[PDB]
Design a protein around this ligand. Structure first.
Ligand code: DUP
Ligand code: MG
Ligand code: MN
Ligand code: NA
Ligand code: NA
Ligand code: NA
Ligand code: NA
Length: 323
DNA sequence: CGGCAGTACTG
DNA sequence: CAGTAC
DNA sequence: GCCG
């Protein structure tokens, strides 16, 4: 819808990789706004008006129109590309990237031979290219089906659904986010051990990034899988097992988008409520720092519509939550 | 002034 | 806990 | 970065 965002996106990523998360959040919102406006902004007024664009941001959008080039883009630290390169390794965030840079590292060859890697980062580096590729949704289906078949094998009751970008109807998916639960509200307990060992038996899972299997309270699995046959690449696979009672909130959460959940959760807070992947709460007590000090009551939410409804919002289809 | 979402692993 | 990621 |  607009081409002034492609210029801001560069700045947003620069602040993000440098650790200035709040400023980056400000640019991210300004960009999600613009991309949502049909009539390309033209006047300073037409800028400030939009929510997520203030003086500072409006001034920048202008330069992109009267000059066709944002000046600041020429004053971005030469460290950014390397910081981005490093933070694109799964398991390494801004802190790790900055430390490696300070240590003199400038390439993945440097990381491979000189940096000490956590177990997750070593896996992330091994699949550096794979993890940056998005798969066609058709492949995401086969993966969701492979997990669903392995799960229903020892319990046909298990309800399995692919969420995230998949459920939002995108053509390509960065990974496959599978939600698993059960209508009886109890048979979901202690299944990770079984499901994972099953997927491991047929050679589907190749690496584990996060999987607390010694804990019978395991809620999530983040790992790597690869379908059988030639021409297959390793793909990221996320799985969460939730009790039916939290099905609507888990589904809403896992479906996203991320910026969508944040906005929805921010809204609930303004209403003295609290929204999480576990439930929607009301009468929540908090302090001046927006920090929760009181639990509050869990509200009944058997469906996603219920969540929207309780928050006083019209229901949005998954594809309409792609923020 | 100061929050900006709420939560689950890892070591 | 800080860091990281969903 | 934005906004209450
Ligand atoms: O910061 C986050 C990240 C994810 N989420 C939720 C929403 C998101 O859609 C879901 C799965 O996260 P992914 O990282 O898998 N993203 P998504 O599936 O939307 O896109 P992609 O195709 O990149 O995987 O978890 C959050 O609430 N906060
Ligand atoms: Mg995803
Ligand atoms: Mn995911
Ligand atoms: Na505005
Ligand atoms: Na990253
Ligand atoms: Na990373
Ligand atoms: Na583990």
């Amino acid at each position: 819808n607009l081409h002034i965002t492609e210029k801001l996106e560069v700045l947003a990523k620069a602040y993000s990789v440098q650790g200035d998360k709040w400023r980056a959040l400000g640019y991210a919102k300004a960009i999600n706004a613009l991309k949502s406006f049909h009539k390309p902004v033209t006047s300073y007024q037409e800028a400030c008006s939009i929510p997520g664009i203030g003086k500072r941001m409006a001034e920048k959008i202008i330069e992109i129109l009267e000059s066709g080039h944002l000046r600041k883009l020429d004053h971005i630290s030469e460290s950014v590309p390397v910081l981005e390169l490093f933070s694109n390794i799964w398991g390494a965030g801004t802190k790790t990237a900055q430390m490696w840079y300070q240590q003199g590292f400038r390439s993945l060859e440097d990381i491979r031979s000189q940096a000490s890697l956590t177990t997750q980062q070593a896996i992330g580096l091994k699949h550096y290219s794979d993890f940056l590729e998005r798969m066609p949704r058709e492949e995401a289906t086969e993966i969701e089906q492979t997990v669903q078949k392995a799960a229903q094998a020892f319990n046909s009751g298990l309800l399995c659904v692919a969420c995230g970008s998949y459920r939002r109807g995108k053509a390509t998916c960065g990974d496959v986010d599978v939600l698993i639960t059960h209508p009886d509200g109890r048979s979901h307990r202690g299944i990770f051990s079984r499901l994972l060992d099953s997927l491991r038996q047929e050679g589907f899972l190749t690496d584990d990034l996060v999987s607390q299997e010694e804990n019978g309270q395991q809620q999530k699995y983040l790992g790597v899988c690869r379908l059988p046959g030639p021409g297959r690449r390793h793909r990221r696979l996320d799985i969460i097992v939730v009790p039916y009672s939290e099905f609507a909130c888990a589904l809403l959460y896992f479906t996203g988008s991320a910026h969508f959940n944040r906005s929805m959760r921010a809204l609930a807070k303004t209403k003295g409520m609290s929204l999480s992947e576990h439930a929607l709460s009301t009468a929540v007590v908090r302090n001046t720092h927006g920090a929760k000090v009181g639990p509050g009551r869990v509200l009944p939410t058997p469906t996603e519509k219920d969540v929207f409804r309780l928050l006083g919002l019209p229901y949005r289809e998954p594809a309409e939550r792609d923020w």
